[PDB]
Chains A and B, each alone.
Chain A
Amino acid sequence: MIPLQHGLILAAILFVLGLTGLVIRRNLLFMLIGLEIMINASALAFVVAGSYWGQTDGQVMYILAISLAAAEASIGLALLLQLHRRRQNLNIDSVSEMRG
């Protein structure tokens, strides 16, 4: 007796909060944090969708979503470590050389 609309609304709220955190923060670590929030919100939305229909498909795509999240966080933190190694700051506005 939990509506599907409420779970989807909660997931959409978490997704837009993650997108806002991804946009308004120049720190690369906070952008990776925002990316984790958005992909976790997408996974939560899929879990809600699979639980409404009574199928394991939601949890299977949750598993695929968090496999992607783990590997993307790995690559993003490796790139963040490399950025901090070669330029000692995580401000991405310095990383803007290609333009036009």
Chain B
Amino acid sequence: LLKRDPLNSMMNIPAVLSRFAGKGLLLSENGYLRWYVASMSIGAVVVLALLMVL
């Protein structure tokens, strides 16, 4: 039962999480200028809302 090294697998789990997160973030680099402007507007809204809350 242990020959597959379960502790090594559980410590390699963060590498798989990082790979999945990198793929999910790279989905947002679609190359569309309208999406880039929309993301800048979204970030402006987010920054302003955070500054108004705090």
Contact = CB atoms under 8 A, between A and B. Distances in A.
Interface of A: 19, 22-23, 26, 31, 92-93, 95-100
18 contacts: A19-B37, A19-B41, A22-B37, A23-B34, A23-B38, A23-B41, A31-B33, A31-B37, A92-B32, A93-B32, A93-B34, A96-B30, A96-B32, A96-B33, A97-B31, A99-B30, A99-B31, A100-B26
A22 B31 CA distance: 16
A42 B37 CA distance: 17
B38 to A, nearest CB: 5
A31 B37 CA distance: 10
A95 B33 contact: yes
Interface of B: 26, 29-34, 37-38, 41
Given A19-B41, A23-B41, A100 B34 contact: no
B34 A92 contact: yes
A26 B33 CA distance: 9
Given A19-B41, A96-B32, A98-B31, 12 more contacts: A19-B37, A22-B37, A23-B38, A92-B33, A92-B34, A93-B32, A93-B34, A96-B30, A96-B31, A96-B33, A97-B31, A100-B31
B22 to A, nearest CB: 11
